[PDB]
Structure 1
Amino acid sequence: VKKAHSFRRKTRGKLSKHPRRRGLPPLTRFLQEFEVGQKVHIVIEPSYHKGMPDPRFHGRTGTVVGKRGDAYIVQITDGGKVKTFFIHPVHLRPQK
């Protein structure tokens, strides 16, 4: 039986947490700041459902190109295409 892709298909592990986190993250993540051109890792936090990208791109590294609202604009290169996302800083982590 062929099954279409959806937001939460095969996410049992990818969007779980070690039972010792089990709650709100420390607040230095919600209050991050990045600059245009900075490289960021995409690391989804499963307790915040706002500003969350397709989990297919969990584990990738992109670059910041701008800002809209409280969300940052992140560009990735999927194969030979550029894709643009508006992601909340709680799902991001800087490279070095």
Structure 2
Amino acid sequence: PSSNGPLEGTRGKLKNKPRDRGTSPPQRAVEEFDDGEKVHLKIDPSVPNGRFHPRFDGQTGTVEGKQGDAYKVDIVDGGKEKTIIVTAAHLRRQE
């Protein structure tokens, strides 16, 4: 890349399909997950806060607790284990 900030090369993954444009439904932003649940990570373009590093878009982690309203999700980046702080607005149950 020409620069190395967090949003480098995120033109597509952080852009909404035109019809999903606009404030998102509150339901998925208030969803509750239990420890051990498998959740897919995907930032919702319309939601500013509670995001993780774009580089983790597409990961399917495991809820292992929470911090405030946000959730702590465990993932394995390559071979490195990491803990991600992310709000329900950017999560989805698996299967």
TM-score tier, shorter chain, comes to over 0.9
Corresponding residue for 2:22?
Answer: 23
Q: CA deviation at 1:7?
A: 1.1
User: What residue in structure 1 maps to residue 91 of structure 2?
Assistant: 92
Q: Does 1:11 find its partner at 2:10?
A: yes
Q: Helix, strand or coil for the counterpart of 1:5? A: coil
Equivalent in the alignment of 1:38: 37
Q: Which amino acid aligns with 1:6?
A: G
Give CA deviations for 1:60-94 in whole Å, capped at 9, x if unaligned: 10000001101000010112211011101000000
Q: What TM-score do you get using the length of structure 1 for normalisation?
A: 0.92
Which residue number corresponds to residue 82 of structure 1? Answer: 81
Cα distance in 1 between the residues matched to 2:8 and 2:56 = 13
Q: Which has the larger radius of gyration?
A: 1
Question: Displaced runs of 4+ in structure 1, greater than 4 A?
Answer: none
Partner SS, residue 85 of structure 1: strand
How much does 1:4 deviate? 4.6
Deviation at 1:5, TM superposition (A): 2.5
**What corresponds to 1:48 in structure 2?**
47
Q: What TM-score, normalized to structure 2?
A: 0.93
Inter-partner Cα distance in structure 2 for 1:67 and 1:23: 28
**Residue identity matched to 2:93:** P
